[PDB]
Design a protein around this ligand. Sequence first.
Ligand SMILES: *[C@@H]1O[C@H](CO)[C@@H](O)[C@H](O)[C@H]1NC(C)=O
Ligand SMILES: *[C@@H]1O[C@H](CO)[C@@H](O)[C@H](O)[C@H]1NC(C)=O
Ligand SMILES: *[C@@H]1O[C@H](CO)[C@@H](O)[C@H](O)[C@H]1NC(C)=O
Ligand SMILES: N[C@@H](CCC(=O)O)C(=O)O
Ligand SMILES: N[C@@H](CCC(=O)O)C(=O)O
Ligand SMILES: N[C@@H](CCC(=O)O)C(=O)O
Lengths: 108, 214, 141
Amino acid sequence: WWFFTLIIISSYTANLAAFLTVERMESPIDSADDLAKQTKIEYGAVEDGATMTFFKKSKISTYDKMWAFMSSRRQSVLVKSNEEGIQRVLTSDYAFLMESTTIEFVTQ
Amino acid sequence: NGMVRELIDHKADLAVAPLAITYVREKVIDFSKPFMTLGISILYRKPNWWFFTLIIISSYTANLAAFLTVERMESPIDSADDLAKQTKIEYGAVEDGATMTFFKKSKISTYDKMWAFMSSRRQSVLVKSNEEGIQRVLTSDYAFLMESTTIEFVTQRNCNLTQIGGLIDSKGYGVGTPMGSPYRDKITIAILQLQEEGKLHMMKEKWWRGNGCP
Amino acid sequence: ESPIDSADDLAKQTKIEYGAVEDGATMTFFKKSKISTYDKMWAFMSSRRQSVLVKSNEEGIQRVLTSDYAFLMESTTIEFVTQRNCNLTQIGGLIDSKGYGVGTPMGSPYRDKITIAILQLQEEGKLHMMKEKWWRGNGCP
Ligand SMILES: *[C@@H]1O[C@H](CO)[C@@H](O)[C@H](O)[C@H]1NC(C)=O
Ligand SMILES: *[C@@H]1O[C@H](CO)[C@@H](O)[C@H](O)[C@H]1NC(C)=O
Ligand SMILES: *[C@@H]1O[C@H](CO)[C@@H](O)[C@H](O)[C@H]1NC(C)=O
Ligand SMILES: N[C@@H](CCC(=O)O)C(=O)O
Ligand SMILES: N[C@@H](CCC(=O)O)C(=O)O
Ligand SMILES: N[C@@H](CCC(=O)O)C(=O)O
C-alpha cells in the first residue's frame, strides 16, 4: 500500500508541475506589441485628440492594427475625457492610451 | 452572386431575406433600414533494487508531467483569440457570405490571422451554407462563424452546441431594393410601424422558441 | 515541437527554405496570388531567387534529399517520388486545385477534337488504366 502512496504523489507532482509551468509562461500586457495582438483587453483614447489622430494616420503595422480595433469598436472604446478613461480602466479590462505626463498624475 | 446579383439586374424588386448590412452591399444596392440586429460569433460545440524502481517512478512522473502540461497549455475556446492561435480546430464560415467578406477586408490583427487560416484552407473549412455549417460542427471538430440569429435558434434546438465568444461585429438584417428605390422608404416607415405595435418581437417567440436546455 | 505540417506552418520559418520549378505553373501562382499566407512565401523565394528556384523537378528531388528544403511540386508527381523514394513525404494538402491539359495555340481548330477525344478516353476507362501503369512505383509504405 506504500507503493500505492508512491504513485498518487507522482500524479500530484505531475499535476503541480503542469500548473506551475503554465502560470510561468504567462506574461502580462507589457508593451504595445504585447497589446496589439489580444482583442480581449480593449483599447481606447480620447475621442478627437492627438493620440486618436496619431493612430489613424500612422503607417506602423503595430499601430495600424491597433486603430482597426478602435475603429471597429468605435462607440464603446473611444471615451470622451481623460476622466472616463480612468473610470474604464478601474472597471473591466481596458488599456487606456494617455499622454506620458498625465500618467504620473494618475499613477501617483 | 446570389441575392445582390439579381437585385442589380432588377430581378426580384423585393428581396426579403437574411440580407445583412455590409459596406460593399450598400454601394451597389441601397437596401433598406434593417428590421433586426446582427452580430457574427462562433458556434463551437458545447463539450461532453530500491534504485531500480526509483528510476521507473521518476520516468512515469516526468511523462505524466509533460502530458498534463501541454494539455493545460492547450486553451479551451472562449474567444476568437485562442480560436485563432490554435490550428487544431479547423474553423470556417459561409463561403461567399457577408461573414467571409468581413474577415477578408478587415485589417485588425486577430481576424486577419483568422483569414490567413481560412484562405490557406479555402477548399476544406469553407461551407456552402449554414446547414453545411451545422453538420460539420456536430460531426467533426469545427467552430462555425454563423451570424447572430442563427446562433440562438440552433442552440435552443441542439443542446450539444453553445455560443462561444461575444459579438465579433455589429450589423443588422436589411431588405434588398434594386439600386435604391423610392419604394424603399415606404418599407422603412412600415417597419417602424410594425415594430412599434410589437408584432416584430411577437413573431420572435413564435418562430425561434426552441425551448432550450438549462 | 511540431514538424513542418502545412504551408502556414511553412510560411513562418525562414530556415527551411522553399522552392519551385522556375517558370512553371507553381512559380506563377505564388507570384500572382493575393492570399497573405502565399504572398509571404513568394517574398522568400523572390529574395533568395538564384538559389531556391531550381530548374527541373529532378533538381528539386536532389535538394530535398540534401539540406533543409521543402520543394513545391504538383500533387501527382509527389506520388511518383513518394513511392519510388521512401525518404520523402507529402506534407500538407492541396494548396490549389489545378488540372493538366493538352495545350493548343490560341483559337486552334484541333482543340474541340482533343476534348471529345479525352471525354471518350476516360469513359472507355483508359485514363485510369494508363494511370496505374506508371504510378506503381514498387508500392513502398
Ligand atoms: C464527447 O467526447 C468524445 C471524445 O472524448 C467526442 O468524440 C464526442 O464528440 C463528445 N460528445 C459530443 C456531444 O461532442
Ligand atoms: C445531441 O445530444 C443528444 C443527447 O442530448 C444525442 O443523443 C445526440 O446524438 C447529439 N447529437 C450530435 C452529437 O450530433
Ligand atoms: C533513402 O532511402 C533509401 C531507401 O529506403 C535508404 O536505403 C537510405 O538509407 C535513405 N537515406 C539516404 C541518406 O540515402
Ligand atoms: N494631449 C492630448 C490629449 C490626451 C491624449 O489623447 O492622450 C491632445 O492634445 O490631444
Ligand atoms: N446573413 C449572411 C448569411 C448567413 C451567414 O453567413 O452567417 C449573408 O447575408 O450572407
Ligand atoms: N505542372 C507544372 C510544373 C511542376 C510544378 O511547378 O510543380 C507546370 O505546368 O508548370
